[PDB]
Amino acid sequence: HMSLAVEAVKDFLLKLQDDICEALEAEDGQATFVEDKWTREGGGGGRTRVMVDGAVIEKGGVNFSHVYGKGIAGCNFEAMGVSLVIHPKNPHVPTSHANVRLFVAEREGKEPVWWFGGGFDLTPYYAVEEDCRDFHQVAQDLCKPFGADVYARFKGWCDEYFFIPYRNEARGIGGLFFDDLNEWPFEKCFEFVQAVGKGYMDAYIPIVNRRKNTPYTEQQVEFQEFRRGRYAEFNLVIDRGTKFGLQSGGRTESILISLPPRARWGYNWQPEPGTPEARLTEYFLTKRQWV
């Protein structure tokens, strides 16, 4: 077993949830996260913290989970992580997502198998060049202590993963994404995920503070809602964690914090040409070179 290492990761994750929620509550100023603590028989449980109808955060969820299972298909396992999605009220604040997680499977006769996964990413509506650059700079900078090609690898993985092929469209401007991370000693992988967690706040919170009071119109909210239909489609059609989780006994409401508060769909809907709305897909979502 790796019992003591796992306990350290768990303590990190619970503190990370607290810290992220505190940061976001400070930006909002009005609403607070409410916790829904849940268990499943034989299976662990989680702490789902949600914000609704804030001054800044219309719909936000920061989930901690620690699940145990018996059936590597036959192995006892534990999986723990923090996952979050934030949907601002103001269209000029991007949506964001982050995750950090560890999986450990105990093996008859052998050393345990383990790996980390995670990342963070930004989904603007009314994007701003310097925010996209600063987000990626935080990502790049946090990676540098861990290896010269770590940013390139995991930024590229993010662009590959958060993509809707049948619309030939990225979900957002990118960030970092990694899975199956065990090529470094455990302590180095743990350091890297702690860096990722801190980096989410470092990357996202300044943007929220900078953008939350930008003036906006009902037409910009309509665009936000049609864009949020695209977001719902990625999560429901493409995202593997959401798909597996719903298919396999996961806690529906915890999994689906990713879904937007309101979404719109229209036949052949597209942004009007020559507008800031159109520039999100014509320029920001295809640039994929921010540092």
* Pairwise CA distance, residues 223 & 242, whole Å: 25
| 3 state SS for 163-214 | EEHHHCEECCCEEEEEEEECCCCHHHHHHHHHHHHHHHHHHHHHHHHHHCCC
In the chain, which ranges are continuous DSSP H helix? 3-28, 129-143, 150-161, 186-211, 218-233, 240-247, 252-255, 276-279, 285-287
Answer yes or no: 97 catalytic.
yes
AA identity, residue 210 = R
Q: Count CA atoms closer than 13 A to 275's CA, side-chain side.
A: 11
Distances (CA, A) of 251 to 40, 47, 142: 9, 11, 32
> Three-state DSSP class for 31?
coil
For the chain, state the CA radius of gyration: 19
CA distance 76 to 68: 7
Reading across the β-sheet that carries 174-181, which strands appear in turn?
A: 34-40, 44-52, 57-70, 76-88, 95-105, 113-123, 174-181
Give the amino acid at 22.
E
Is residue 105 within 8 Å of residue 77, measured between CB atoms? yes
Annotated binding residues for substrate, as ranges? Answer: 83, 99-101, 249-251
Determine the straight-line distance between the first and last CA of the chain, rounded to whole angstroms: 41
Q: For residue 38, give Cα distances in angstroms to 33, 243, 247, 252, 273.
A: 16, 21, 19, 12, 47
User: Residues comprising the binding site?
Assistant: 83, 99-101, 249-251
Contact by Cβ (8 Å): 197, 9: no
- DSSP structure string for 58-89: EEEEEEEEEEEEE--TT-EEEEEEEEEEEEES
Task: Give resolution, Å, one decimal.
Answer: 1.4
* Catalytic choice (66, 87, 92, 97): 97
Largest CA distance in the chain: 63
Q: What domains appear along the chain, each with residue ranges and CATH number?
A: 1-291 (3.40.1500.10)
Orientation angle between helical segments 3-28 and 186-211, nearest 10 degrees: 10
